[PDB]
Amino acid sequence: ADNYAATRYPIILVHGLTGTDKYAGVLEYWYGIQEDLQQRGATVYVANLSGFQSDDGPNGRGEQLLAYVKTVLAATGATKVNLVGHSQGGLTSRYVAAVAPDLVASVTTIGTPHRGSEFADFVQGVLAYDPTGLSSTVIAAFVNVFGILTSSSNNTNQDALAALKTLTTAQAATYNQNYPSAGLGAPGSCQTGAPTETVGGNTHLLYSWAGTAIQPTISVFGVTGATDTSTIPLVDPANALDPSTLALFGTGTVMVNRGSGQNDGVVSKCSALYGQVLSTSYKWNHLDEINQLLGVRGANAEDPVAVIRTHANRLKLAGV
Ligand SMILES: [Ca+2]
Ligand code: NA
Numbered sequence: 296a297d298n299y300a301a302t303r304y305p306i307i308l309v310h311g312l313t314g315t316d317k318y319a320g321v322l323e324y325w326y327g328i329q330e331d332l333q334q335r336g337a338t339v340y341v342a343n344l345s346g347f348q349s350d351d352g353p354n355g356r357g358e359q360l361l362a363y364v365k366t367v368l369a370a371t372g373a374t375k376v377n378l379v380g381h382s383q384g385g386l387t388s389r390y391v392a393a394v395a396p397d398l399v400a401s402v403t404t405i406g407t408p409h410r411g412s413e414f415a416d417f418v419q420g421v422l423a424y425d426p427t428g429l430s431s432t433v434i435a436a437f438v439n440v441f442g443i444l445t446s447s448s449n450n451t452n453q454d455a456l457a458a459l460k461t462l463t464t465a466q467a468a469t470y471n472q473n474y475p476s477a478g479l480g481a482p483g484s485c486q487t488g489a490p491t492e493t494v495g496g497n498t499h500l501l502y503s504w505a506g507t508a509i510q511p512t513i514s515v516f517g518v519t520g521a522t523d524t525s526t527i528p529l530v531d532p533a534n535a536l537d538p539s540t541l542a543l544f545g546t547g548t549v550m551v552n553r554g555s556g557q558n559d560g561v562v563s564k565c566s567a568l569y570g571q572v573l574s575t576s577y578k579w580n581h582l583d584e585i586n587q588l589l590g591v592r593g594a595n596a597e598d599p600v601a602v603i604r605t606h607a608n609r610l611k612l613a614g615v
Contacts, residue, residue, distance in 0.1 A: 298336035300607035303615055304375045304400045305338040305367055309360060311382025311407075312458055313442070316343040320447040325381075326586040331600050337607050340367045342384075345450055346442045347458040350386045351473065354452055357390030364391060364398055375400040377610055379603070381585050382406055382562065383462065385503070385569070386470065393474045396494035400615040402478070402570070403502040403606060406559050406584045409479060410566040411467030413553040414546050419463055431456060467566075476501075478570035485565035487572045500613055501570025502606070506559035506579030508596065509547030521548045525578040525593030537591035543580035559584065577602070 310316070310324045317323050325341060332339045342363050344356045351357055364376055377400050378388035385407025392399045408415075422431050435455045442453035460466050468482060477493075478501035480486030492499050508525035523544040526533055533540045543560025555563040559581040567575070577584075579599065583592045586599040 296334050296336075300332050300604055300611065301336035302338075302377055302607055302610045304377050305340055305371050305373050306332065306377045306379055306607060306610075307360075307364065307367060308339065308341045309378060309380035309384035309388050310342065310344065310346075311380070311384045312462065313346045313445070314344070314382075314384070315346055315446045315448075315450070316341040317447045318445045324585065324587075326590055327600060328586060328603055331604055332607055335604060335607070338371060338373075343447055343450075344387065345452045345454070346446060347438060347453040347455045349454070349457045349461045350383065350390050351470070352457075354454070355390075356383070356387045357394070360387050361391050361395055361398075364395070368398065374398075375615075377401045377403070377615055379403045379606075380405065380407060382408065382581065383458075385409065386461075386467075389474055389476060392492075392499055393476070393494065396497035396499065399497070399499055401500040401502065401610060401613075403610075404567070404569050405504060406506055406562045406567055406581055407503065407569065408462055408467060408562045408566045409471070409569050410482070410563075411464030412462050412561050412566065413464065413550050413555045413563065414561045415459060415462035416464055417549055417553060419459055422459075476569070478503075480568065485568065487568040487570060490571035492570075500610070500615055502573055502609075503567060503569035503571070504573045504577065504602075505562065505564050505567035505575045506577045506581060506584050507557040507564050507575055508578045508580045508583065508593070509544060509551065509558045509560055511551040511556065519548075519551045521551045523547070523580065523593065525580055525583060525596040527594045531593050533591055533593040533596075537582075537588040539582045539588045540580060540591075540593065543582065547580070573606070 385404030
C-alpha cells in the first residue's frame, strides 16, 4: 500500500513464554501483525524460539535469537535489526542487544516483565507446597510436551521449570544485574531509564509500553478487587468470544492481591518500564497487546495493530 512502516533495518518480532512463530504451524503469535507491517512497507521477520526456556545460558532463548538475527542479516543484506519483543521476548531482545550491540538498532518491549511477574512468584510458590516435589516433575513434563507439540518446528528444547524461574521477581532482579541496561531505572523505583544506550560504541533506541486493563478498584478486609477496564462492564462480547479475557482478569486479580498494582494480567505497569515509555495507559490485557485470540479485544481497548504500525513509523522517523 505505502511505506508508512518502512524502517531502515528489518524488524524482528520476538515472542514470549509458550510462544513460537505459529502455534501448531497454524496460529500466528503476532496475530495479523507481520502482514499489516509488510503491507505498509516494512521488512519483517518473526522469530521462532523455545516457548519454554531461560533467556541466558547455552540452550537459552538469547543465543537462539542471536543466531536467528544473524540469519536474517545474511538474507536481507542488512547490518542491524530492530527488535520488538512481547512479554519474555523483551528480555530475550535485551540479551541480544547486550551481547551483540553492533547487530541491533533498537529494542522495543511490549508488556515485558523486566522486573519479573508476581504471578510467576505465585505459581512457583504453589509448586513449592508439594512436599514430595513430584508435581514439579509432572507439571513440567506436561508443559514441556505442550511446548514441543505447539512449536511450529516441534522444538524439543523446552524447559518449563527454567522458564518459570526466569520470570520470578527474584530471578529477574539477578538478570538485570547480569545484563544491565541504561534503559532501566533503579530496582524497586518503578521508574524507567534513558531513551537510548550506547554499548561498545553502538547506539540503540529504546522503547516500551504496557497494558493496564486490570486496575485495582476496591479493597476490603485485606482483599483487593480489580476491574477489567478493557471491557464494557459484564456485557462486553470480548468476554464470550475470547477466553483469555476473563482468564487474565482472574490472574490479574491474583496479581493485585500480591501488591502488583495495575497490570495486564501477568505483568505489572512497573515491571514493564524500559527506555522511552510511550504509554502505560492502554486498556489491554496481556494478549490484547499482540492482537490475540484472533483479534478479539474489549470495547475500550485500543487497536494493537495500529499501535504497532505507528511505532514502526516512529522507528522510521527516528532513522532506524
Ligand atoms: Ca483479547
Ligand atoms: Na527500509
